[PDB]
Structure 1
Amino acid sequence: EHCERLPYDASKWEFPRDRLKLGKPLGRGAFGQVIEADAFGIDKTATCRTVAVKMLKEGATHSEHRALMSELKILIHIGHHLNVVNLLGACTKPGGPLMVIVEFCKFGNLSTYLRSKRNEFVPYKDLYKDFLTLEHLICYSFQVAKGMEFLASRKCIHRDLAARNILLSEKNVVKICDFGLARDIYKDPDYVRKGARLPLKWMAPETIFDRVYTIQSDVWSFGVLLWEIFSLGASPYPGVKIDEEFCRRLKEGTRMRAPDYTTPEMYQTMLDCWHGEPSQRPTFSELVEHLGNLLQAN
């Protein structure tokens, strides 16, 4: 499951630490961090490139180092896709810290970004040049579904799909990622204490109750991600304490109301992703086809 059998090809991925100029932090948890860096010649010969470097911080143990190595292997296993954050290289040599180097995405995470554009949105479109529109939102949804369809094809599951784990790069390209240990999950209100600190508002009933993670529970989370996108970055389940009674109502069939910027069809898609039976939710392949059609109709 963590790719401990498949090897690391150093000649392909290894990047020298002394060609990496580390800069300002991009995100910090308790044990992990992401740092902005300039990398000389990491992918194009003798060309300086801005990159994002995931690494441990002081306080990390070897257990987190093992987790970071497994993350490097998972990214190598998954391979390249436009809508998955692109692995560029790694620093794995002894005598320095493990570093996982990925592409830098200009606009950061999608939640924060959308939350800043409420005053820069029109449903259908020079004064409006940098505005989001309904087309951008369906387009972002489409791209995340394509990315997840790809992940499913590599026999992977995300386990933490949410707008905070989507990056927005140039030209309206979104990329799925996992900040993981580079997010302070104690101080982040999206992760609630259960037994573990877990993203309960994004989790399917079977995951909350039976600790079952499959690609179909990722579909549930994708539905919540849609809600985040068509609320322009609102926090899910507004006005609700996330306690025992929330978990019961969810099981009983309670669901979020339509968000402010949704279409009727998009809301029905959120409801489809939140079907109580995992097998009756759409697949990511069906989500791709469906969102592609909605993009046409738009």
Structure 2
Amino acid sequence: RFHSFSFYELKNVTNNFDERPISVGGNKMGEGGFGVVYKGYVNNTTVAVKKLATTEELKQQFDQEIKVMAKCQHENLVELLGFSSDGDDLCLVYVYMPNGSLLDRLSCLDGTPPLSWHMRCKIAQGAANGINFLHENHHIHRDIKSANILLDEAFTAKISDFGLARASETVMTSRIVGTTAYMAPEALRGEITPKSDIYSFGVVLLEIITGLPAVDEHREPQLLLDIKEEIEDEEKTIEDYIDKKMNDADSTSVEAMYSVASQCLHEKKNKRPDIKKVQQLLQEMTA
């Protein structure tokens, strides 16, 4: 590999790390991946500059991201162009993702139009191809969530944030990391397994179908994953949950996606399907 950018070049392209949103004329794009993501124009290309943002742990999150990215190059993974360590903050430089994150697009943040079911199927498929790639290369993401699934100019799914990623090639840890609302029961307990990434992708699929965030304090249920139980203990059905902000979603394909999410969300890690099966089931859904 990557370019080694100076902290000062990245200051100039990001207009001295402007915390102002894009709408007002600033450079801040969003925060939530152990830092703030800014917009910039480096080497004649539009870039995304992640300014990180224990201090020891955060430096290891930086070093792992570059480590994973160096080995891992796929069309469903975000492309890291370079980095900065020389200055007062740790910066990561990526190819700009014009359609931001899946989370933001499912909530229509900034007035973007709702994603069609057709686009939603392509995103689900692409994200599974990116997880498959990581799993085939003995990497466990540890933080699969819609905020970490980025979208390009063609709405191609691009997995990002490999700062918490772990190589294999079942282990345990004292430092439990990830997003609570997406995490597998064993992962919340300290277990490091690719089966936990499958569970997290199951929550993502429920966000795709429903357009609902994994967690909402002002909602019943507060956690999206509880809906699997509401549907099973026939209080409600999947149709009562389908995102109303779509006009092309047929029940057959939606039920087919829920079937995959349901299988992914099995509480027994050993009973969950592997990524290649998830990928296979998602391909059969379209075609």
Q: Flag whether TM exceeds 0.5 (same fold).
A: yes
Residue 152 of structure 1 aligns to which amino acid in structure 2?
H
Instruction: Report deviation, 1:221.
Output: 0.8
The residue number in structure 2 matching 1:71 is 65
Structure 2 residue runs of 5 or longer lacking an equivalent are: 16-26, 165-174, 244-250
2:242 corresponds to which letter in structure 1?
D
Partner of 1:159, secondary structure, is coil
> Could you tell me whether the CA contact under 8 Å between 1:165 and 1:179 is conserved in 2?
no
Query: How far 1:201 sits from its partner (Å)?
Result: 2.3
The answer (yes or no) to whether the contact 2:65–2:163 under 8 Å persists in 1 is no
- The alpha carbon displacement at 1:85 in A equals 0.9
Counterpart among 147, 170, 182 of residue 130 in structure 2:
147
Equivalent residue for 1:271, pick from 262, 267, 271: 262
Other structure's SS at 1:260 match: coil
Shift of 1:212: 1.1
CA-to-partner distance for each residue in 1:121-166, whole Å, 9 max, x for gaps? xxxxxxxxx7633221111100110010011112111111111111
Query: Which residue number corresponds to residue 104 of structure 1?
Result: 96
Give 1:234 deviation, angstroms: 3.6
Task: Determine the structure 1 residue equivalent to 2:142.
Answer: 159
Q: Match for 1:212 among 191, 203, 213? A: 191
Instruction: Encode CA deviations 1:194-248: one digit per residue, 9 max, x unaligned.
Output: x97852321112223x321211111111111000011124445851356xxx8xx
TM score, norm. by length of structure 2: 0.73
- Give the whole-Å Cα distance in 2 for the aligned partners of 1:179 and 1:37: 21
Specify every segment of 5 or more residues in structure 1 that has no aligned partner in the other structure, as ranges. 1-8, 41-47, 121-129, 182-194
Aligned to 2:35, which of 32, 38, 48?
A: 32
Count of residue pairs brought into register by the alignment: 244
Tell me the CA shift for residue 17 of structure 1. 4.6
Matches within 5 A, 1:181-220: 199-208=179-188, 210-220=189-199
Map of 1:15 onto structure 2: 5
| 1:168-183 equivalences in 2 (<5 Å) | 168-178=151-161
| TM-score of the pair, normalised by structure 1 | 0.70
**Residue 51 of structure 2 aligns with which residue?**
55
Q: Relative to structure 1, is the Cα distance of residues 206 and 29 closer, same or farther in structure 2, using a 3 angstrom cutoff?
A: closer
Check conservation: 2:83, 2:93, Cα contact below 8 A: yes
Distance in 1, Cα, partners of 2:3 & 2:181: 37
Secondary structure of 2:14's aligned partner = strand
Deviation for aligned residue 1:90: 1.8
Deviations 1:239-293 (A, max 9, x none): 1356xxx8xx98xx98996231462211111111112322221111111122112
2:285 & 2:36 partners in 1: Cα distance?
A: 38
Change in 2 beyond 3 A, CA 1:233/1:168: farther
Structure 2 distance, partners of 1:63, 1:264, is 42
Question: Which residue in 2 is equivalent to 1:192?
Answer: none
The residue identity in structure 2 corresponding to 1:281 is R
| Residue identity in the other structure for 1:74 | V
The CA distance in 1 between the partners of 2:60 and 2:115, in whole Å, is 41
- Give how far 1:18 is off: 5.2
C-alpha root-mean-square deviation of aligned residues, in Å?
Answer: 3.3
* Partner Cα distance (1:98, 1:207) in 2: 28
- Partners of 1:63 and 1:288 lie apart in 2 by 33
Q: CA deviation at 1:30?
A: 10
Q: 1:113 aligns with which of 105, 110, 129?
A: 105
